[PDB]
Design a binder for this molecule. Structure first.
Ligand SMILES: Cc1c(NC(=O)CC(C)C)c(=O)n(-c2ccccc2)n1C
Ligand SMILES: Cc1c(NC(=O)CC(C)C)c(=O)n(-c2ccccc2)n1C
Lengths: 412, 412
């Protein structure tokens, strides 16, 4: 029926590094990217730390002139996208430009730009609003600007599914390729929600960790003293490519994208069901899509946000799907180190899943000092674990009960 | 080797009515839904009119308690979705709930809520932000809340592709069904961007008509005195359903969704290429997807925003795709009456395209007093035109050069 999809390029901005290799080095070393926020005064907020991108220079990617019209989340998405395309070695021509598209998403988009324009509006009226405000702030402009810069004329769209955005973006891009609508897609997500509205909005819901005294210990998935997620910024992008297309041009293949599953909890606007039933259906859908039995899974990059309800639901879901094999696989949350990159989480975590396959190493869950009741799987506590990994699964779950799972496999 | 997709239910809020029949009556009568905006003081703005939803009562759909947590764009999306599901007659059970999903999108989402929370933040600090601000404002919560209210556990996501949102949402939902990922999808879009940031943001770009003296004459697609688009609010939703599934339960079928095409211009962040080359590729992709020749198209619901560059580009694209047949088909812009519903435009216009098939009538382009250079097609100026319509095509184009086309056909 359908064509095979491989990963030929990757790119990233994260709290651990300004590219993929630097981020991954941090991941394998168990390094935290979390620190007190420097770019605003959070004296009035109950959370004053997060995962910032440190030392980003947009002028590596864009002229200063172009960059000034774009919200940070667009700058970040473009940086990761450009990295991924260069990493792939793909040359865009008239013969293929209609076959190359883009699906880069975001959970909340240009919140910083909105906040700044809203200050001008209230203080001075609508005349001080930027002419570039709309195109420089809306979520589909990563896809838009990337297509313009690289001459990409294929399917051009953007997902916004909260914390599931990056996973859905990659999965649906893979579908485009499998079904023949494109031969190449740049896919993933980006987020920069570290502004007053973001910190204040999540804080108002009491969803964020408030461990201001020890920011690097705040994100502690499955630990009994977890107290909410850590807000982080950045971007991940992957070049997905039809297999024969990749082979014909001698592309370096990182891994194969073999499965994509989706589900809805239909339970609650922000909380998962305690048994993770929706997450279970999603993982099973992804495995069925990949033609894999649960027992063939070696590594799970969990969603693992460090929220009370979320973390335990994901354990329940994994035990339901995997049975006894739940105790043979390794499962880790790299959010322990990166925090929660929101709409970018699924994108950077897809990249980490691919690199786990490349390097045959399960990244750690740092800060897992005291696993909570029932959190008795191999959660790769504290230190990276070299091991055999043929199949890696990556989960994302989001507000609205919206679930996504990707399955990657070593490529021969 | 894929399954057929039919439309079994429709729902709508528009500037012409609080449901589909009332809106369509206005469409066929050539009525304008455009008026001076009443819900805010626009004395400081250069545009003071738009297409408002008049007399909406959210309590027809939701308790007051539930509604106070939701931005207007979510309220509108849910109203259209609930209408569409009721219209379809579908009964959700344990046997089918995993096979029913939702794809309702938005271009800018909860701008009103953001603006109000930003006022509280600046005046009083972050402690005044609502706990419901994030889940009540993010774009994927139409899909989220609908799934929760109706118990829908199938694919759950949201597109955000500017003015193309509603078209992409419907097309990609159709793909889910065709490829067996779902048997039923509720799909479309909603928008409520009529706040200071919205009017101010589009005004700053000088994109809006400023014909404040005659609001009902402002939206005039292809007319030589057009001066930008008219901002409008509302929602459209369709129940898409696999054909055998519909037949088995005795569903009333409105029409068949036979084609979906996408492209990128890769040209400019807001302006289309003068020749509409991207729009041409998109329409051809949709026709190829449907297995139709251009000569089988009888009616085009144009994007037709009443912008200088946009309107003429779409004429060029139609002449390119259809050749001599461009002069045999009928093409109209219902934005002449409704204005531009942004992320909802493609959804309400898909509904209008389906009803054109049902009623064998091409809706008018009102206000087309003096067609501009080269606008010499049958643009259904002024008055509705009864005629044979077997195939109806609906276009949406958006910021970032992102294009979508849907093709519907009469169902036997
Ligand atoms: C905490 C959070 C989300 N939920 C999850 O991560 C799922 C888990 C805890 C069961 C989620 O979707 N968001 C979010 C991301 C982007 C925009 C809006 C909301 N957050 C913060
Ligand atoms: C005018 C406008 C857009 N562009 C078009 O309608 C296509 C153009 C060739 C006439 C568009 O995408 N938006 C928009 C919609 C939602 C959010 C952001 C932007 N507008 C206003």
């Amino acid at each position: 029926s359908r064509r095979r999809v491989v990963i030929t390029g990757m790119g990233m901005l994260s709290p651990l590094g300004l590219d993929v290799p630097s981020s991954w080095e941090g991941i394998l070393a168990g390094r935290s990217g979390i620190a007190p926020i420097e770019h605003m005064d959070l004296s009035a907020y109950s959370t004053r730390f997060g995962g910032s991108v440190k030392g980003f220079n947009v002028e590596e990617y864009l002229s200063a002139k172009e960059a000034r019209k774009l919200d940070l989340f667009i700058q970040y998405g473009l940086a990761a996208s450009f990295q991924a395309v260069r990493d792939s070695g793909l040359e865009v021509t008239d013969a293929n430009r209609e076959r190359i598209g883009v699906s880069m998403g975001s959970g909340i988009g240009g919140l910083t730009n909105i906040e700044n324009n809203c200050r001008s509006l209230f203080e001075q009226g609508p005349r001080r609003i930027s002419p570039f405000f709309v195109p420089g702030s809306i979520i589909n402009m990563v896809s838009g600007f990337l297509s313009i810069h690289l001459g990409l004329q294929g399917p051009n769209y953007a997902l916004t599914t909260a914390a599931t955005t990056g996973t859905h973006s990659i999965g649906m891009a893979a579908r485009n390729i499998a079904y023949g609508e494109a031969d190449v897609m740049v896919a993933g997500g980006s987020e920069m929600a570290a502004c007053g509205l973001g910190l204040g909005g999540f804080g108002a819901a009491r969803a964020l960790s408030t461990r201001n005294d020890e920011p690097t210990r705040a994100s502690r998935p499955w630990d009994r003293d977890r107290d909410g997620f850590v807000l982080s910024d950045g971007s991940g992008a992957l070049v997905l490519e039809e297999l024969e297309h990749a082979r014909a041009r001698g592309a370096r293949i990182y891994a194969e994208l073999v499965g994509f599953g989706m589900s809805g909890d239909a339970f609650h606007m922000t909380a998962p069901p305690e048994d993770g039933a929706g997450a279970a259906r999603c993982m099973k859908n992804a495995l069925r899509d990949a033609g894999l039995d649960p027992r063939q899974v070696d590594y799970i990059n969990a969603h693992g946000t460090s929220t009370p309800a979320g973390d335990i639901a994901e354990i329940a879901a994994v035990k339901s799907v995997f049975g006894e094999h739940a105790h043979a696989l390794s499962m880790s949350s790299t959010k322990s180190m990166t925090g929660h990159l929101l709409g970018a989480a699924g994108a950077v975590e897809a990249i980490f899943s691919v690199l786990a396959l490349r390097d045959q190493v399960a990244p750690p869950t740092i800060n897992l000092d005291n696993p909570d009741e029932g959190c008795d799987l191999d959660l790769v506590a504290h230190e990276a674990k070299p091991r055999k990994i043929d199949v890696a699964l990556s989960n994302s779950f989001g507000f609205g009960g919206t679930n996504g799972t990707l399955v990657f496999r070593r490529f021969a």
